Write a protein that binds this ligand. Structure first.
Ligand code: HEM
Ligand SMILES: [Cu+2]
Ligand SMILES: [Cu+2]
Ligand SMILES: [Cu+2]
Ligand SMILES: [Cu+2]
Ligand SMILES: [Cu+2]
Length: 153
């Protein structure tokens, strides 16, 4: 569970993501699909994209990244009070896209990597720790909402 100070550090580095949502989104997907090629199979409409440059050039992938990180930012900004924001996301990812919690772990790791790559100085151990705890809380709660919908992934 996060202190007030940890939420501040989460929201501090999130403000940096907000200076270029599309770009961070692209780098997170690139890192994710590269580290964990199986996740690219769920992302069905992006299978045609065979190199890093093609990924960067896909407007479709870039718009998708903004939709994702916008949803995630809205959740983070609630500092744990996110049931209303989590429910819709749990609904499509459980019953429509069928995304295992393992895959939410892989994208959390990709987020942390891109934030560390882009902002070492806004992203030391304490800030890393806080974002990790925030993403852990998101994954725990979405896992509980999955089970409520009858999905065990
Ligand atoms: C931080 C974690 C994530 C957030 C906030 C998130 C958010 C979203 C949002 C807001 C949408 C569009 C509306 C919807 O269908 O719900 C979406 C679409 C989708 N998401 Fe996620 N997502 C996350 C992780 C994942 C992971 C790890 C995968 C699979 C590897 C995944 C697969 C999909 C697919 C297949 C779609 C539909 C894409 C399309 O057809 O355009 N998502 N995601
Ligand atoms: Cu950044
Ligand atoms: Cu995605
Ligand atoms: Cu509450
Ligand atoms: Cu490093
Ligand atoms: Cu700063």
């Amino acid at each position: 569970v996060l202190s007030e100070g940890e939420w501040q550090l989460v929201l501090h580095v999130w403000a940096k993501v907000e200076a270029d949502v599309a770009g961070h989104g692209q780098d997170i997907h690139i890192r994710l699909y590269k580290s964990h090629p199986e996740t690219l199979e769920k992302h069905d409409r992006f299978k045609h994209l065979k190199t890093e440059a093609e990924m960067k050039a896909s407007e479709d992938l870039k718009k998708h990244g903004v939709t994702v990180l916008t949803a995630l930012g809205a959740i983070l900004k609630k500092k744990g009070h996110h049931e209303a924001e989590l429910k819709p996301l749990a609904q499509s990812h459980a019953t429509k896209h069928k995304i295992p919690i393992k895959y939410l772990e892989f994208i959390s790791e990709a987020i942390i990597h891109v934030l560390h790559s882009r902002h070492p100085g806004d992203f030391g151990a304490d800030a890393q720790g806080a974002m990790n705890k925030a993403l852990e809380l998101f994954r725990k709660d979405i896992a509980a909402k999955y089970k409520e919908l009858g999905y065990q992934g």
